[PDB]
Amino acid sequence: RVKSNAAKKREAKANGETVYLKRQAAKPRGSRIISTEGNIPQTLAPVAYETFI
Amino acid sequence: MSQVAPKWYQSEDVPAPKQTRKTARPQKLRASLVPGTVLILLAGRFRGKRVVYLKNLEDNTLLVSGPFKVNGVPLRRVNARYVIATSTKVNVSGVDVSKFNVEYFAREKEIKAERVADQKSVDAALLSEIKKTPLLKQYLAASFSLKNGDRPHLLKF
Amino acid sequence: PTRLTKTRKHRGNVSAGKGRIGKHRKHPGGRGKAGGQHHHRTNLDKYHPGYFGKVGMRYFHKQQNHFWRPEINLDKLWTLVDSEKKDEYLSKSSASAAPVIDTLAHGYGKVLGKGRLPEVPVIVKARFVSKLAEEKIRAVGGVVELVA
Amino acid sequence: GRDHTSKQHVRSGHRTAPKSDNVYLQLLVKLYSFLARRTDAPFNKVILKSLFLSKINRPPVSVSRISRALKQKGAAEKTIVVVGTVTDDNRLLEFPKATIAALRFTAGAKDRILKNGGEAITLDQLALRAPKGQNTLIVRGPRNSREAVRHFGFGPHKGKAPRILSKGRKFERARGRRRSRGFKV
Amino acid sequence: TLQKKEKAQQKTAEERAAAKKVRKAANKEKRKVIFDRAAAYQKEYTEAERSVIKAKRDAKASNSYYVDAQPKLVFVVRIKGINKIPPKPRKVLQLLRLTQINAGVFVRLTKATSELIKLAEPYVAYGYPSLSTIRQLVYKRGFGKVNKQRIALSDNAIIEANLGKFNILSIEDLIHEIYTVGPNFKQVSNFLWPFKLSNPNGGFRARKFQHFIQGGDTGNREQFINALVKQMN
Amino acid sequence: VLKKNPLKNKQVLLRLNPYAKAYAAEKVGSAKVEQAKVKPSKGQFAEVLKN
Amino acid sequence: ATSVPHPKIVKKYTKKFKRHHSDRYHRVAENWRKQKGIDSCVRRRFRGTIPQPNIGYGSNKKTKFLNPAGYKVYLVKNVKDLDVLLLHTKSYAAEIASSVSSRKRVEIVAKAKKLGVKVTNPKG
RNA sequence: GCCUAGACCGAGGACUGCGGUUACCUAGGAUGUUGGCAUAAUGAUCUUAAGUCGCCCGUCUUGAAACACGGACCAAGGAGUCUAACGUCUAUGCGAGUGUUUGGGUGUAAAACCCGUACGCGUAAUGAAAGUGAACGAAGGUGGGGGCCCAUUAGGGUGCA
RNA sequence: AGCGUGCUACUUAUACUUCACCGUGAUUGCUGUUUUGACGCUUUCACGAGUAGGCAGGCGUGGAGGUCAGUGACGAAGCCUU
Ligand SMILES: [Mg+2]
Ligand SMILES: [Mg+2]
Ligand SMILES: [Mg+2]
Ligand SMILES: [Mg+2]
Ligand SMILES: [Mg+2]
Ligand SMILES: [Mg+2]
Ligand SMILES: [Mg+2]
Ligand SMILES: [Mg+2]
Ligand SMILES: [Mg+2]
Ligand SMILES: [Mg+2]
Ligand SMILES: [Mg+2]
Ligand SMILES: [Mg+2]
Ligand SMILES: [Mg+2]
Ligand SMILES: [Mg+2]
Ligand SMILES: [Mg+2]
Ligand SMILES: [Mg+2]
Ligand SMILES: [Mg+2]
Ligand SMILES: [Mg+2]
Ligand SMILES: [Mg+2]
Ligand SMILES: [Mg+2]
Ligand SMILES: [Mg+2]
Ligand SMILES: [Mg+2]
Ligand SMILES: [Mg+2]
Ligand SMILES: [Mg+2]
Ligand SMILES: [Mg+2]
Ligand SMILES: [Mg+2]
Ligand SMILES: [Mg+2]
Ligand SMILES: [Mg+2]
Ligand SMILES: [Mg+2]
Ligand SMILES: [Mg+2]
Ligand SMILES: [Mg+2]
Ligand SMILES: [Mg+2]
Ligand SMILES: [Mg+2]
Ligand SMILES: [Mg+2]
Ligand SMILES: [Mg+2]
Ligand SMILES: [Mg+2]
Ligand SMILES: [Mg+2]
Ligand SMILES: [Mg+2]
Ligand SMILES: [Mg+2]
Ligand SMILES: [Mg+2]
Ligand SMILES: [Mg+2]
Ligand SMILES: [Mg+2]
Ligand SMILES: [Mg+2]
Ligand SMILES: [Mg+2]
Ligand SMILES: [Mg+2]
Ligand SMILES: [Mg+2]
Ligand SMILES: [Mg+2]
Ligand SMILES: [Mg+2]
Ligand SMILES: [Mg+2]
Ligand SMILES: [Mg+2]
Ligand SMILES: [Mg+2]
Ligand SMILES: [Mg+2]
Ligand SMILES: [Mg+2]
Ligand SMILES: [Mg+2]
Ligand SMILES: [Mg+2]
Ligand SMILES: [Mg+2]
Ligand SMILES: [Mg+2]
């Protein structure tokens, strides 16, 4: 990670731009759209009790 | 108490008060308080008396007359919080109340000739307008009291 | 003064700062140096090692006057020169005429060699000198004269 | 109620005034309380704190320490500041011309500074020729050279000095100080 | 001395009047800046709301499902007293600056802070605060940590003097930085003294110390944190 | 010496937020949204009613 | 308030703090003593027990030491003792010592009236 | 956005600040007015009644109101002291020295004042002892280090403890 | 007015919010206006349980040096007393 930060910093320095090297914890996910072509929702219900012995 | 002498740094000068920003604003009266409204007095000598409201003085008080002939309540001031404002109204547009103010009721038994003359002059117009409504003079001449089973939170006035 | 002691502040509190369970008994643990090998070993071993046992040989009738030999180092040797004439001696001293410092007459038995001398000849009279003390005196052009 | 993350009602643990009731030391505190409060110079804030210190926290500064501090490169004409007593050193071979401001001077110290062309001034005289401590150099004496420190942190294999009244072969040298007598610590 | 002190007071009054004239003239521009900033914040709030609404409607129309972006901010209120807390949740509550009952703090949701709040979960009620809730909190009970002292946020100069290096010049800049979790959320939320709320007007549920899901008060209530804060602030 | 609530004191509200005046002037608290009368759920979203 | 103006005087506790069981036993005087016992109901602050002195009852620093008339009271034993109250006649009142004779007490009252000093015990 | 009912509070005490309306303000803490009282309305205490709560203190104890122990009552007396030698800390005097008080001088006579040789401790340690006995160097190098010097964010120099 | 369960309102701890006052700790500033208190004045914030025990600041007693040219037979000390 030290090498990667050094490589990324010089590359941003080479391109004259900035790069952020601090690690981040996992963030909450963004918005998204769920396609339903081939994936129409299937309805589930709780199942009755059975004995299998 | 003890033997502790005052020190030189214990000053006796009284500081001035800070500049107050409590600029007074005019009194708001209840919507039911309209000149000519019949009022019920709740405290004082004339408690229970039904009287006519005439003018809002600059002292935040109400100018009131009985009329004196019907009630025995003369021209005087009352406080708005010691008054029940009923819904009965008398046309007082024909009553001249220009000369009445705070300085009229200034403290100096007997009674001024001016005050007696004003009583008669006001009561003439007041009686003239009162006669139009039947039983209004009788209503004004009768005292108010709470009967058994009277709930002031349920009664309309 | 008694008015400053904590005995005056403990008045009114039952146990006088001694505890309600432990109390202030006569001599718990013994008197004096009792139990130094059994229940006070942890104290003597930690803070006073070497306490128990014999080391070395005895010396019947030891007279400490025999071993009297106060030490003076070289950095303090010129303090025995007269204060009113020290600066003159520091200037006019040569091989032909150097100040005499009688160390025994000032109460010293041995001259030791800590520190540095002025590069100035001196005549030092001593009962004893160290090897390095005499080497430093000769280097500044001085000499050591043994006395008794 | 509060879940306290630190101890409540805790004094700073630093002296804010001298323990001494000497009125003349108070005058010096009077002067440097004003200077530290108003000059933004870090020198004046250090001096005010040093005036509070106890006797063992202001060890004497020998005239040899001042000589060695003046022998730093570019420090030969600096003003030596000692918040405490300046003592003499009869082991010096020579002393330079210097200006030294101290709480106290010994007779030998005052003689030696003035003999070599220097000045021995007080700390109030310092505040007029150097109200911000310009071109100064604070010298502190050895704190760990005290005799009481010899016995601090004593223990097995600690190498400190035992608290003992007499010294000799019969005094705390046998068991625990020698492998021939059991163990050695 | 009467005329001496009157002359000095009138002279210093004139100097103060001139300096205040100049100061107000200079500050007018700064107030225009913060006015523009607040207007822009309102505009972007409205634009984002309408954009999300439109995206939901379009996904509904186009046989799809718009999944909302996960919340980036949470408001955590300690609703439990200070007695009988195990060392690890006690340390977690101390590090969240929740050292009394009814203390509130803003937390930016990631993984480290989420696992922190999970450790303190049986002792706190938390949720996702709305913009009006943040505004009301900061306006009524907003305090700053100035030289380790709790100072009321009664003037924008205090906020500027403490957060201008983070581009916070107004109380609305601070509210925006909290709400839309900004690059300086850490400094702005740590500058904010923990909110010291009252008890709810209307009470809690019959038994607080059980999860919001099971009919209690602890855990994540999400949009009902706004009603709870309305009760308690 | 005495904290005043900007949600109660209008002068303090204008002192802290100068944009509140425009908010009041523009009736931002009751601003209408202009849009068409549409219903985009007529199709597959009726999977909510039954399945 | 005929003295230098002061805030309204507040006394947090107006009764006497009486030592526990100074009512049960004659040997126990009413002078306050703090209970130090391990089981003491008063030291443990049980509900229904007597109030105890603590720093919370301390007087307002602006009304502390002021008598009901608004003055701080200074003890006077002779006529020369009134000299320290010359510039404090509106904030300090004089109280004549009990052991001053009936002759010298008349002189103190006479000079105090001349100087404007108020006397808290003017009759005895 | 608007209207409306009630309760508690009024700390501060010339001015200083931020805003608003554009001089004034509701904007860094209550003012205005009226009535009554000053032989008193008001406040405090004591006694007592009522309501509510309140078990006997001290002690040893994990646990005492305990069916654990002392205590019928009262007054007076009544228990961490002084000394020899010491540790830490602090104040003071002098300082590589320090300590006049064993003694001598002196005296207004157990005081105060004055005097000095020795001696104690310190200034050298280590070894069982015979014995030996502290500068390679600017009294050492390295990394920090308050303060000081040169600068000009930064940077450099010097750097006591 | 029991049991299981849901709901609306309501009751009140020395707990929470705001405020007054006390103390502790910190803190802002205070000498050409420091000005007969700088061991002092002042701004601000937070906090306050406690046996054994520690420390600090105070109350009281016998006697001593100094001082009040202090009280007192025209009434000291002591004692009784809403
Ligand atoms: Mg970068
Ligand atoms: Mg009739
Ligand atoms: Mg105590
Ligand atoms: Mg104690
Ligand atoms: Mg105790
Ligand atoms: Mg006892
Ligand atoms: Mg005790
Ligand atoms: Mg003890
Ligand atoms: Mg006992
Ligand atoms: Mg014990
Ligand atoms: Mg054994
Ligand atoms: Mg001998
Ligand atoms: Mg030897
Ligand atoms: Mg040593
Ligand atoms: Mg936080
Ligand atoms: Mg309610
Ligand atoms: Mg409820
Ligand atoms: Mg609820
Ligand atoms: Mg409940
Ligand atoms: Mg319940
Ligand atoms: Mg509320
Ligand atoms: Mg009292
Ligand atoms: Mg009392
Ligand atoms: Mg009361
Ligand atoms: Mg009794
Ligand atoms: Mg117990
Ligand atoms: Mg008597
Ligand atoms: Mg006031
Ligand atoms: Mg004009
Ligand atoms: Mg205002
Ligand atoms: Mg009971
Ligand atoms: Mg027992
Ligand atoms: Mg036992
Ligand atoms: Mg038992
Ligand atoms: Mg018991
Ligand atoms: Mg039993
Ligand atoms: Mg027993
Ligand atoms: Mg028995
Ligand atoms: Mg027994
Ligand atoms: Mg018994
Ligand atoms: Mg018995
Ligand atoms: Mg003598
Ligand atoms: Mg004699
Ligand atoms: Mg000697
Ligand atoms: Mg029941
Ligand atoms: Mg139920
Ligand atoms: Mg039920
Ligand atoms: Mg409910
Ligand atoms: Mg109060
Ligand atoms: Mg201070
Ligand atoms: Mg003072
Ligand atoms: Mg508390
Ligand atoms: Mg306490
Ligand atoms: Mg005494
Ligand atoms: Mg005695
Ligand atoms: Mg005496
Ligand atoms: Mg009696």
Q: What single string gives the DSSP state of each residue in E154-187?
A: -SHHHHHHHHGGGT--SHHHHHHHHHTT-TTHHH
Residue C135 to residues A10, A37, A40, Cα–Cα distance (Å): 66, 106, 107
CB atoms within 10 A of CB E204: 16
- Residue B145, SS3 per DSSP: coil
Residue B75 burial by CB count (10 A; 0-12/13-18/19+): exposed, middle or buried? buried
- Provide the token pair at B132: 């139009």
Q: Is the CB of G124 under 7 A from strand I?
A: no
Pairing of strands C143-146, E103-108: unpaired
CB distance from F45 to chain E under 8 Å?
yes
CB atoms within 10 A of CB E75: 23
CB distance from B14 to chain G under 8 Å?
yes
- Provide the token pair at C117: 């001398």
Say if residue B67 is preceded by a cis peptide, omega within 30 of 0: yes
Is there a contact between D3 and E101 if contact means CB atoms under 8 Å apart? Answer: no
Q: How far is the CA of C115 from the C1' of H140 (A)?
A: 16
Report d(CA E96, CA E117) in Å as an integer: 9
- Which one-letter amino acid corresponds to residue E114? S
What residues contact residue B72 under an 8 Å CB cut-off, 6+ apart? B46, B49, B66
Q: How far is the CA of F7 from the C1' of H3 (A)?
A: 18
- Residue E64, SS3 per DSSP: strand
Q: Is the CB of G16 under 7 A from strand I?
A: no
Q: Is the CB of G51 under 7 A from strand I?
A: no
Nearest to B126 by CA among B68, B83, B82, B77: B68
Pairing of strands C128-129, B37-41: unpaired
State the method: X-ray
Q: How far is F11 from chain A (nearest CA, A)?
A: 40
Q: How far is the CA of F28 from the C1' of H1 (A)?
A: 10
Q: How far is the CA of G34 from the C1' of H55 (A)?
A: 20
Task: Tell me how far apart the terminal alpha carbons of chain G are, to the nearest angstrom.
Answer: 24
Alpha carbon of G16 to ligand 22 centroid (Å)? 6
Is there a contact between E60 and F41 if contact means CB atoms under 8 Å apart? Answer: yes
Q: How far is C76 from chain D (nearest CA, A)?
A: 6
Could you say which residues from 158 to 217 on chain E have a Cβ atom under 8 Å away from some Cβ of chain F? 170-172
CB distance from E55 to chain A under 8 Å?
yes
Q: How far is the CA of D78 from the C1' of I40 (A)?
A: 37
Is there a contact between E67 and A34 if contact means CB atoms under 8 Å apart? Answer: yes
Q: Is the CB of C23 under 7 A from strand I?
A: no
Report d(CA C110, CA C23) in Å as an integer: 58
- Residue A51, SS3 per DSSP: coil
Residue B51 burial by CB count (10 A; 0-12/13-18/19+): exposed, middle or buried? buried
CB distance from G97 to chain B under 8 Å?
no
Q: How far is B74 from chain G (nearest CA, A)?
A: 41
Is there a contact between G91 and B5 if contact means CB atoms under 8 Å apart? Answer: no
Residue A18 burial by CB count (10 A; 0-12/13-18/19+): exposed, middle or buried? exposed
Alpha carbon of D114 to ligand 43 centroid (Å)? 49
Q: How far is G37 from chain C (nearest CA, A)?
A: 8
- Residue E54, SS3 per DSSP: helix
Alpha carbon of D171 to ligand 13 centroid (Å)? 16
Nucleotides of H under 7 A from a protein CB: 1, 4, 10-21, 24-35, 44-46, 53-62, 64-66, 73-75, 80-82, 85-97, 123-124, 126, 128-129, 132-135, 138-139, 146-149, 157-161
- Which one-letter amino acid corresponds to residue E220? N
Residues of chain F in contact with residue E61, where contact means CB-CB under 8 angstroms, are 40-41, 43
Determine the nucleotide nearest to G97 by Cα–C1' distance. I71
Pair G2, G70: CB distance under 8 Å: yes
Report d(CA D42, CA D45) in Å as an integer: 5
**DSSP H helical segments within chain E, as ranges?**
2-61, 87-95, 112-119, 131-141, 156-163, 171-179, 185-191, 224-232
Residue B53 to residues B64, B136, C69, Cα–Cα distance (Å): 5, 15, 124
Q: Which of residues 2-31 of F touch strand I (CB under 7 A)?
A: 2-3
CB distance from B113 to chain G under 8 Å?
no
Count Cβ–Cβ pairs < 8 Å, chain C vs chain G. 7
**DSSP 8-state secondary structure symbol assigned to residue G2:** -
Residues of chain F in contact with residue E42, where contact means CB-CB under 8 angstroms, are 19, 23, 28
Report d(CA B38, CA B89) in Å as an integer: 6
CB distance from G33 to chain C under 8 Å?
yes
Q: Is the CB of D29 under 7 A from strand I?
A: yes
What residues contact residue B54 under an 8 Å CB cut-off, 6+ apart? B35, B36, B62, B63, B64, B65, B75, B92, B95, B97, B100, B122
CB distance from D2 to chain E under 8 Å?
yes
Report d(CA G115, CA G117) in Å as an integer: 6
Q: Which residue of F has its CA nearest to A44?
A: F51
Pair E156, E171: CB distance under 8 Å: yes
In our burial notation (b when 16+ CB lie closer than 10 A, e otherwise), range F6-42 reads beeeeebbebbbbbbeebeeeeeeeeeeeeeeeeeee
Is there a contact between B6 and G95 if contact means CB atoms under 8 Å apart? Answer: no
Residue G41 to residues C14, F4, G15, Cα–Cα distance (Å): 17, 46, 21
Nucleotides of I under 7 A from a protein CB: 6, 9-12, 14-19, 21-28, 30-31, 33, 36-40, 44-49, 51-61, 68-77
E strand or H helix that includes residue F20: helix F20-25
| Dihedral, C73, C75, C77, C82 alpha carbons, nearest 10 | -150
Nearest to F21 by CA among C76, E31, C38: E31
CB atoms within 10 A of CB A17: 8
Residue A2 burial by CB count (10 A; 0-12/13-18/19+): exposed, middle or buried? exposed
Report d(CA B121, CA F48) in Å as an integer: 83
CB distance from C15 to chain D under 8 Å?
no
Chain centroid to Cα B107, Å, comes to 16
Nearest to A33 by CA among E51, E52, E64: E64
Q: How far is the CA of G55 from the C1' of H54 (A)?
A: 24
Touching pair G, E by Cβ (3+ pairs < 8 Å): no
Alpha carbon of B58 to ligand 29 centroid (Å)? 28
Resolution for this PDB entry, in angstroms: 3.0
- Which one-letter amino acid corresponds to residue G34? K
CB distance from F24 to chain E under 8 Å?
no
**DSSP 8-state secondary structure symbol assigned to residue G88:** G
Q: How far is the CA of B119 from the C1' of H99 (A)?
A: 112
Partners of B53 in the β-ladder? B64
Could you say which residues from 80 to 119 on chain C have a Cβ atom under 8 Å away from some Cβ of chain D? 115-116, 118
- Which one-letter amino acid corresponds to residue C34? A
E strand or H helix that includes residue B118: helix B113-130
Pairing of strands C110-111, C71-72: parallel
Is there a contact between G87 and B5 if contact means CB atoms under 8 Å apart? Answer: no
